[PDB]
Write an enzyme that holds these catalytic residues in place. Sequence first.
Site, PDB file in Angstrom:
ATOM      1  N   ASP A  21       0.789  -1.435  -0.119  1.00 55.62           N
ATOM      2  CA  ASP A  21       0.005   0.055  -0.084  1.00 55.62           C
ATOM      3  C   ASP A  21       0.655   1.356   0.189  1.00 55.62           C
ATOM      4  O   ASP A  21       0.010   2.532   0.087  1.00 55.62           O
ATOM      5  CB  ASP A  21      -1.006   0.194   1.115  1.00 55.62           C
ATOM      6  CG  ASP A  21      -2.361  -0.637   0.682  1.00 55.62           C
ATOM      7  OD1 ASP A  21      -2.397  -1.279  -0.348  1.00 55.62           O
ATOM      8  OD2 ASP A  21      -3.288  -0.323   1.508  1.00 55.62           O
ATOM      9  N   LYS A  24       3.119   1.774  -4.932  1.00 53.25           N
ATOM     10  CA  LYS A  24       3.482   1.097  -6.185  1.00 53.25           C
ATOM     11  C   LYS A  24       2.458   1.371  -7.356  1.00 53.25           C
ATOM     12  O   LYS A  24       3.174   1.730  -8.537  1.00 53.25           O
ATOM     13  CB  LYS A  24       3.979  -0.420  -5.894  1.00 53.25           C
ATOM     14  CG  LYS A  24       5.186  -0.469  -4.769  1.00 53.25           C
ATOM     15  CD  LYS A  24       5.272  -1.972  -4.460  1.00 53.25           C
ATOM     16  CE  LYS A  24       4.006  -2.559  -3.886  1.00 53.25           C
ATOM     17  NZ  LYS A  24       3.912  -2.006  -2.491  1.00 53.25           N
ATOM     18  N   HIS A  85       2.720  -7.155  -0.477  1.00 54.76           N
ATOM     19  CA  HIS A  85       2.325  -8.014   0.238  1.00 54.76           C
ATOM     20  C   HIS A  85       3.342  -8.993   0.646  1.00 54.76           C
ATOM     21  O   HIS A  85       3.896  -9.703  -0.175  1.00 54.76           O
ATOM     22  CB  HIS A  85       1.029  -8.693   0.003  1.00 54.76           C
ATOM     23  CG  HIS A  85       0.047  -9.295   0.995  1.00 54.76           C
ATOM     24  ND1 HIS A  85       0.503  -9.577   2.252  1.00 54.76           N
ATOM     25  CD2 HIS A  85      -1.111  -9.352   1.166  1.00 54.76           C
ATOM     26  CE1 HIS A  85      -0.390 -10.103   3.016  1.00 54.76           C
ATOM     27  NE2 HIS A  85      -1.529  -9.879   2.299  1.00 54.76           N
TER      28      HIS A  85
HETATM   29  N1  GNP Z   1      -2.790  10.236   0.215  1.00 53.57           N
HETATM   30  C1  GNP Z   1      -2.262   9.514  -0.899  1.00 53.57           C
HETATM   31  N2  GNP Z   1      -2.780   8.233  -1.086  1.00 53.57           N
HETATM   32  C2  GNP Z   1      -2.154   7.571  -1.986  1.00 53.57           C
HETATM   33  C3  GNP Z   1      -0.795   8.104  -2.837  1.00 53.57           C
HETATM   34  N3  GNP Z   1      -0.481   7.173  -3.756  1.00 53.57           N
HETATM   35  C4  GNP Z   1      -1.446   5.951  -3.578  1.00 53.57           C
HETATM   36  N4  GNP Z   1      -2.331   6.368  -2.325  1.00 53.57           N
HETATM   37  C5  GNP Z   1      -3.374   5.360  -2.238  1.00 53.57           C
HETATM   38  O1  GNP Z   1      -2.823   4.579  -1.111  1.00 53.57           O
HETATM   39  C6  GNP Z   1      -3.656   3.207  -1.420  1.00 53.57           C
HETATM   40  C7  GNP Z   1      -2.641   2.161  -1.874  1.00 53.57           C
HETATM   41  O2  GNP Z   1      -2.035   2.649  -3.190  1.00 53.57           O
HETATM   42  P1  GNP Z   1      -1.483   1.385  -4.154  1.00 53.57           P
HETATM   43  O3  GNP Z   1      -2.623   0.429  -4.431  1.00 53.57           O
HETATM   44  O4  GNP Z   1      -0.244   0.752  -3.582  1.00 53.57           O
HETATM   45  O5  GNP Z   1      -0.984   1.934  -5.299  1.00 53.57           O
HETATM   46  P2  GNP Z   1       0.673  -0.530  -3.712  1.00 53.57           P
HETATM   47  O6  GNP Z   1       1.930  -0.485  -3.161  1.00 53.57           O
HETATM   48  O7  GNP Z   1       0.506  -0.695  -5.450  1.00 53.57           O
HETATM   49  N5  GNP Z   1      -0.237  -1.940  -3.247  1.00 53.57           N
HETATM   50  P3  GNP Z   1       0.075  -3.452  -3.243  1.00 53.57           P
HETATM   51  O8  GNP Z   1       1.487  -3.281  -2.231  1.00 53.57           O
HETATM   52  O9  GNP Z   1      -1.029  -4.081  -2.464  1.00 53.57           O
HETATM   53  O10 GNP Z   1       0.559  -4.055  -4.495  1.00 53.57           O
HETATM   54  C8  GNP Z   1      -4.548   3.539  -2.490  1.00 53.57           C
HETATM   55  O11 GNP Z   1      -5.765   3.831  -1.731  1.00 53.57           O
HETATM   56  C9  GNP Z   1      -4.018   4.538  -3.221  1.00 53.57           C
HETATM   57  O12 GNP Z   1      -5.148   5.395  -3.716  1.00 53.57           O
HETATM   58  C10 GNP Z   1      -0.355   9.305  -2.603  1.00 53.57           C
HETATM   59  O13 GNP Z   1       0.453   9.843  -3.125  1.00 53.57           O
HETATM   60  N6  GNP Z   1      -0.971   9.957  -1.322  1.00 53.57           N
HETATM   61 MG    MG Z   2       0.383  -2.692  -6.301  1.00 50.35          MG
END
Ligand code: GNP
Ligand code: MG
Length: 405
Positions: A21, A24, A85
């Site tokens: 989260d 990425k 994850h």
């Molecule tokens: N406030 C804020 N939220 C963000 C930002 N970038 C991403 N998010 C939010 O943080 C959450 C996780 O983002 P993500 O899905 O990971 O783009 P992750 O790292 O790809 N997830 P995973 O590790 O499960 O693959 C989502 O609710 C996304 O909208 C940012 O710059 N600011």
């Molecule tokens: Mg991701």
Amino acid sequence: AKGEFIRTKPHVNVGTIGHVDHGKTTLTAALTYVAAAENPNVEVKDYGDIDKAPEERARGITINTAHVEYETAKRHYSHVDCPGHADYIKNMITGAAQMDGAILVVSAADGPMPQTREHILLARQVGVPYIVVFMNKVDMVDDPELLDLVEMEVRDLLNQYEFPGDEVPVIRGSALLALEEMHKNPKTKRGENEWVDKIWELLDAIDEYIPTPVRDVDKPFLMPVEDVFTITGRGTVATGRIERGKVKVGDEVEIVGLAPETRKTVVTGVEMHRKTLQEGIAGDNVGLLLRGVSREEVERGQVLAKPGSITPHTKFEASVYILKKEEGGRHTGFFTGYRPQFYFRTTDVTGVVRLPQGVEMVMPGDNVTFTVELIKPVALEEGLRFAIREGGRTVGAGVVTKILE
RNA sequence: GGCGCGUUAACAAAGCGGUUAUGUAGCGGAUUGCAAAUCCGUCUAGUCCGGUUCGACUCCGGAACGCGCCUCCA
Ligand SMILES: Nc1nc2c(ncn2[C@@H]2O[C@H](COP(=O)(O)OP(=O)(O)NP(=O)(O)O)[C@@H](O)[C@H]2O)c(=O)[nH]1
Ligand SMILES: [Mg+2]
Ligand SMILES: [Mg+2]
Ligand SMILES: [Mg+2]
């Protein structure tokens, strides 16, 4: 009548790694969006287009790697978005097995977490040479002094695993804000928006820090298989990053590893991102069409190589460092008979540990050398790095020192 | 790629954080005039590798193999 990949600019493979989260996926979509605004070749990839599986839709996370291409003014890219994850690191390793450089995503709101250092160590043992950090979610941090702290700790974490932490570019920003902006108005260019510019800061960091790897086209072909598709009307296709050599159509190659046989086949195709290539060379994220081969005669973990160049092995001694208790490893030592999982490039395979006469136990945080016998053969090289994982955590990082056979 | 399901001894089938479930043939052995009926003996018990524990077949992790269901189109 199809579309050929012209080498207008140098090609480099990149990806995103980091704790769950931390951002990425959002940053990946953001990259394709800003890069497209400038370069019309970049096909836009939205968040939904990245995490497209129903498990990913509902469960709200990236479970398997996604492949997206884009380009700056300087170089072409093949971006592989990795899962953060802890349960799906198996797939994170496979993505890192194709990166000439990795973007370490660290949320400013949380800082360096368990899968942050875990990906640093893993990416290293899977070939990833250089890293470009990206402090995401700055929009959630008030105290600037906290962002300084975050940057400082990420540098220490890199220097902990022999990466040039002090020299590594740390670009602060917000993928969410930059992506949002690109939607309202996709015509946005550099200098027009501060959040979008922070993403351009990133593209520029990638362009200037991660070098275009020296291409080993003078060495015998070797293409670690990363994925196997069954293309209707064409046949079976293998995909991965060419480690050395070249591969034009009509070339014969061997599928070595994870099987008693060392199957032969002729290549009837070679493509870089849905685009036919004259002859894929080292560093290319190709897709080779294998003749006679079926959908299950080849799989991830194996390796396409120059016939005879590689002979699969099982036994070998190696120098290993067993992670400490506070590195996400074991808290208790182990002995002979221990059967963990070993990771060599895109290969995961169970092997048995054989401690040398003179040593009876191995404690966490110890640098020790020992033999290993895999339940299956695989392309091995003296010097090749690898990982040891068991019980959902990484337990050791080693280097092959001698192939026993 | 993901999720689920199956793995106790030669085979069949249980319960349980610790002091022996159990059944059934293949073989051996007493025994029978020779058999049979009946007893004595036999056979990788928890697939494998880690954790918690004084103690693990039992609890938590991983792995192998098998089988299903989505995903998987350069
Ligand atoms: N406030 C804020 N939220 C963000 C930002 N970038 C991403 N998010 C939010 O943080 C959450 C996780 O983002 P993500 O899905 O990971 O783009 P992750 O790292 O790809 N997830 P995973 O590790 O499960 O693959 C989502 O609710 C996304 O909208 C940012 O710059 N600011
Ligand atoms: Mg991701
Ligand atoms: Mg079923
Ligand atoms: Mg295609």
